[PDB]
């Protein structure tokens, strides 16, 4: 079933900040904001962890769209291959979630990678979830239109943070 990261890195503070730093041409800004909040609350509502949205500076969870190299030693690679990636909880790049601007992203109303599912998967990583062996799990390693966290996803996050 679920994986965490080696040594179970987790947020140590009651409150974790997150910033949507950069946006996609594919969607309105507010749509990315509301889908990220939704992706975070899907994990959030299961655990004793609270997210505060910040609109400037460095937050614990830096979220954005990037083309190619974007300062974290894991450059994006243009259309296809890598779609997105994220870092386990930690200082600096820890917690950060990046989306490759050279794919196509949708809110579900158009063609594209479903951004809500993608953001739920990457922010799983941001909170300390590894890849699940369970195909139903959002944290399954391969890529959505109508979904929720699986019982494996809930089990894993609650094992790392506790319930409620």
């Amino acid at each position: 079933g679920y994986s965490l990261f080696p040594n179970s890195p987790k947020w140590t503070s009651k409150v974790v900040t997150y910033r949507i730093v950069s946006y996609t041409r594919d969607l309105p800004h507010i749509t990315v904001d509301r889908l990220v909040s939704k992706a975070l609350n899907m994990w959030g509502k299961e655990i004793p962890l609270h997210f505060r949205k910040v609109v400037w500076g460095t937050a614990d969870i830096m979220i954005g769209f990037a083309r190619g190299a974007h300062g974290d030693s894991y450059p994006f690679d243009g259309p296809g291959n890598t779609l997105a990636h994220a870092f386990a909880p930690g200082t600096g790049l820890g917690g950060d979630a990046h989306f490759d601007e050279d794919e196509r992203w949708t809110d579900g109303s158009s063609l594209g990678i479903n951004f809500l599912y993608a953001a739920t998967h990457q922010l799983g990583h941001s909170l300390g979830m590894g890849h699940s062996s369970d195909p139903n799990a959002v944290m399954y390693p391969t890529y959505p239109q109508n979904f929720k966290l699986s019982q494996d996803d809930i089990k894993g996050i609650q094992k790392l943070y506790g319930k409620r």
């Binding site: 890598t82 779609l83 997105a84 990636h85 870092f87 386990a88 990583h125 590894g130």
Partner: peptide
């Protein structure tokens, strides 16, 4: 992709 999950990195450290």
């Amino acid at each position: 992709x999950g990195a450290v």
